[PDB]
Design a protein around this ligand. Structure first.
Ligand SMILES: OC[C@H]1O[C@@H](O[C@H]2[C@H](O)[C@@H](O)[C@H](O)O[C@@H]2CO)[C@H](O)[C@@H](O)[C@H]1O
Length: 138
């Protein structure tokens, strides 16, 4: 597998029609997963499944600018399970990131960071065994 935390370079940033696919397996008794699409030190799109926030499972999405987190967008639809293999697909579309998990649409996150071609790294972290991380233009 891959070593977690894992950094995937995104050469020349992202662009609509770029599809990023993450394959892995959630560890037993997982607490968190995170994808961090970064523009330098900023996080354009943080995607953060939390397995136990006040005994609830929730996905928290946000943006970090100049070391400040913005307004959280929360999704209670939670397709992950401790112990199970998953596929996360993040498709960049003109106005938003579109996320599907295990081939089912999960959420969209509107672009707050506008310079898409400067979002040049994806950090993958958390309680997973990471199998692959890649991208393709569709
Ligand atoms: O916003 C994403 C960001 O959240 C931090 O945790 C927040 C928490 O969600 C919020 O409810 C509380 O009031 O403040 C915390 C600190 O900002 C995470 O620590 C961070 O890793 C991101 O996930």
């Amino acid at each position: 597998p891959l070593i977690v935390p894992y950094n995937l370079p995104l050469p020349g940033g992202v662009v609509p029609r770029m599809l990023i696919t993450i394959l892995g397996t959630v560890k037993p008794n997982a607490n968190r997963i995170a994808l961090d699409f970064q523009r330098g030190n900023d996080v354009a799109f943080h995607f953060n499944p939390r397995f136990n926030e006040n005994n609830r499972r929730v996905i928290v999405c946000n943006t970090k600018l100049d070391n400040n987190w913005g307004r959280e967008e929360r999704q209670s639809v939670f397709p992950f399970e401790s112990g199970k293999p998953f596929k996360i697909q993040v498709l960049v579309e003109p106005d938003h990131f579109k996320v599907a998990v295990n081939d089912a649409h999960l959420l969209q996150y509107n672009h707050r960071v506008k310079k898409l071609n400067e979002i040049s790294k994806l950090g993958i972290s958390g309680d997973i065994d990471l199998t692959s991380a890649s991208y393709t233009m569709i």
